[PDB]
């Protein structure tokens, strides 16, 4: 048990002003605090709320060594990829979850927040990569990707693609192409003092 009663800064993450681009997902550690998870589910303002390795239904009774809140933005069609053992540009090249993943995956539409007349091009995703991503790995490199047999010398063109490409977050877009904000709660349980707990 913690022995100290400090509410956890969950608001910092969900109600954050701007969200990171999925290729450079943001990660907030959470420790030395207490928080009511069931408040989130109860709010029921979210569109996807899927948990793996633990019951969502009022499971605050448990105490974990550390918690990790990973936040980013993607499309709706792509939310299906933020789960264990899924494939796709996002799960391969941007954000991978381990197959033994014990955590929760929360996603909600943000078309009002993250759309802009004429398109929002602040949110990128990685399109080309030589190898798939290992779980919980992050790649922020921008080196020109050389698809051809000839070298690129850091110049954009055919067979010489800039690896990151922008979402076309048009306000008039279909739901599958509307921005969605995603938060992934990972529960690091180890042989160490439990610094996060439930209520009371």
């Amino acid at each position: 048990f913690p022995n100290i009663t400090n509410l956890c800064p969950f608001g910092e993450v969900f109600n954050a002003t701007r969200f990171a681009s999925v290729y450079a997902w943001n990660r907030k550690r959470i420790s030395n605090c207490v928080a009511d998870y069931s408040v989130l589910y109860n709010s029921a303002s979210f569109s996807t709320f899927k948990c793996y390795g633990v019951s969502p239904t009022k499971l605050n009774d448990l105490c974990f060594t550390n918690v990790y809140a990973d936040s980013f933005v993607i499309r709706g069609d792509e939310v299906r990829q933020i789960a264990p053992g899924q494939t796709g540009k996002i799960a391969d090249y941007n954000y991978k979850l381990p197959d033994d993943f014990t955590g929760c995956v929360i996603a909600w539409n943000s078309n009002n927040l993250d759309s802009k007349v004429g398109g929002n091009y602040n949110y990128l995703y990685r399109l080309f990569r030589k190898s798939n991503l290992k779980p919980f790995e992050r790649d922020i490199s921008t080196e020109i990707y050389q698809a051809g047999s000839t070298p690129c010398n850091g110049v954009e063109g055919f067979n010489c693609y800039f690896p990151l490409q922008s979402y076309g977050f048009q306000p008039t877009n279909g739901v599958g192409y509307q921005p969605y904000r995603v938060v992934v709660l990972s529960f690091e349980l180890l042989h160490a003092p439990a610094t996060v707990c439930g209520p009371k």
Partner: antibody, heavy 120, light 108 residues
Framework: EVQLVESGGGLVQPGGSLRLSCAAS????????MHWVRQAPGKGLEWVAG????????AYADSVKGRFTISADTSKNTAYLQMNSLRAEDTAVYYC?????????????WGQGTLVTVSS | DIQMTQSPSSLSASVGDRVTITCRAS??????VAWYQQKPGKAPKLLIY???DLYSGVPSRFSGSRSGTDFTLTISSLQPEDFATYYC?????????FGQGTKVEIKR
């Protein structure tokens, strides 16, 4: 409503020249790459040439390298394929299409196509 | 200069069946494959891009998959409009190359 319309197709003798035009509407050529894809009767699809409208960079298929020349105009918002030293093998339906970026993406919109016949 | 080998060359199946079409690339193309549908006398219509991304205005039955350098197009259930020819296309290394083609014919 994005639209792509071909024009300039016709009949030409072997060794002649013919310039196909592809007028685009509902979008600006900037940031896109325009391609010419031909289909011989009852056969597969074969890519021919492509151009990044903004920078002007071009790319051609080995089978027609040198004979053909792809160009674009940003004020007219149209793309052109000049075809010189034509051969009977080049007889086909010529479509124009667009893709995002220099590559990695598909062809969103295709024109209805124009027939080119190369016969004496 | 990559080669896209497409199978099957021809396929006959009944309405409501689930269909699978495969395209194998000579080299790695990351996820730069696309799938098109063509009916007689009409331009190709874009179905899938970047391997597994649906295009706007395209029935959700169409799905796309990538296993290494093998790419797959799947129809959950066939409909009378889905009878036509299907091509795969790669936009990784120029010149961009299409597949030989897969014709889908209604069984009778």
């Amino acid at each position: 409503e994005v639209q792509l319309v071909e024009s300039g197709g016709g009949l030409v003798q072997p060794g002649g020249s013919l310039r196909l035009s592809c007028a685009a509407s509902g979008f600006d050529l900037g940031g896109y790459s325009m391609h010419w894809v031909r289909q011989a009767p009852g056969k597969g699809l074969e890519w021919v040439a492509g151009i990044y409208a903004s920078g002007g960079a071009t790319a051609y298929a080995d089978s027609v390298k040198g004979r053909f020349t792809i160009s674009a105009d940003t004020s007219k918002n149209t793309a052109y394929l000049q075809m010189n030293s034509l051969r009977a093998e080049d007889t086909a339906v010529y479509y124009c299409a667009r893709s995002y970026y220099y590559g990695g993406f598909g062809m969103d919109y295709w024109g209805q196509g124009t027939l080119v016949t190369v016969s004496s | 200069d990559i080669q896209m080998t497409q199978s099957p060359s021809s396929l006959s199946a009944s309405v409501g069946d689930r269909v699978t079409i495969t395209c194998r690339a000579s080299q790695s193309v990351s996820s730069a494959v696309a799938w098109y549908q063509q009916k007689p006398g009409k331009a190709p219509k874009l179905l899938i891009y970047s391997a597994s991304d649906l295009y706007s205005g395209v029935p959700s039955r169409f799905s796309g998959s990538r296993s290494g350098t093998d790419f797959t197009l799947t129809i959950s259930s066939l409909q009378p409009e889905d009878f036509a020819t299907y091509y795969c296309q790669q936009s990784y290394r120029y010149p961009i190359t299409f597949g030989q083609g897969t014709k889908v014919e209604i069984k009778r």
